[PDB]
């Protein structure tokens, strides 16, 4: 359900994600690293399952950030894919891919993989 | 089909993989990069399914290469996980993980992911 996902969340390295879940399945907000402050803020867009299975199943969701804002351009995009498991301690558990723009010759080492856990702090 | 895995294989960027498959599931051999020089070679060891299914399914397999030999040590290791398909055009389809030894601070950016298709051509 949209309400539980909407809020401020944080991961183990100290990055901040702010997100609003719209009733048609849309996600929008901003992403920041632990330095905080305005510019490390980047736009994110994503989608989630607006009608989750009952059970104690999580809600599947995913989102993209392209690392360009008005102050910096890293020439790269990260996608996170994972599930929201709500309860007292609400959590979003993800795995992510970071791709960089490269020449044809260096394409074989363009993408990094990893995983992140977000703990919720506010709506 | 099973033992058709023993041979010489090439991926899409010119790297060469020579393997021996043992009857009980072991995979042993050498891997070398393009440029071809006699020590871009490194040792590999792996495992495969020695009694695969009888429907038209592929044979599951995997192997590791630590990137150290007598000349170079790139303080990293790659694993390939995938499956063998025989026929007149045999091939091995894989995806891989390359991890580098990092300090804790850089641990989040330690691993690269990719895909390779090996054939005997």
């Amino acid at each position: 359900a949209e309400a539980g996902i909407t809020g401020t969340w944080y991961n183990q390295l100290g990055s901040t994600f702010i997100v609003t879940a719209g009733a048609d399945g849309a996600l929008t907000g901003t992403y920041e690293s632990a330095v905080g402050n305005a510019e490390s803020r980047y736009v994110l867009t994503g989608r989630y399952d607006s009608a989750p299975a009952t059970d104690g199943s999580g809600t599947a969701l995913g989102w993209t950030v392209a690392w360009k804002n008005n102050y910096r351009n890293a020439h790269s995009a990260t996608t996170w894919s994972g599930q929201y498991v709500g309860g007292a301690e609400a959590r979003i558990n993800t795995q992510w891919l970071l791709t960089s723009g490269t020449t044809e010759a260096n394409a074989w080492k363009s993408t990094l993989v990893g995983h992140d856990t977000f703990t919720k702090v506010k709506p | 089909a099973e033992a058709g895995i023993t041979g010489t294989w090439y991926n899409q960027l010119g790297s060469t993989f020579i393997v021996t498959a043992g009857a009980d599931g072991a995979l042993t051999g050498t891997y070398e990069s393009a440029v071809g020089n006699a020590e871009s070679r490194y040792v590999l060891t792996g495992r495969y399914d020695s009694a695969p299914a009888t429907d038209g399914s592929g044979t599951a397999l995997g192997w590791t290469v630590a990137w150290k030999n007598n000349y170079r040590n790139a303080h990293s290791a790659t694993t390939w996980s995938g499956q063998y398909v025989g026929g007149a055009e045999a091939r091995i389809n894989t995806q891989w993980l390359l991890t580098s030894g990092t300090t804790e601070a850089n641990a989040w950016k330690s691993t690269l992911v990719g895909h390779d298709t090996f054939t005997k051509v």
Binding site: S33, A34, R72, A74 | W108
Partner: peptide, 6 residues
């Protein structure tokens, strides 16, 4: 360095 993390 990358802006994803610190």
């Amino acid at each position: 360095s990358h802006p994803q993390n610190t």
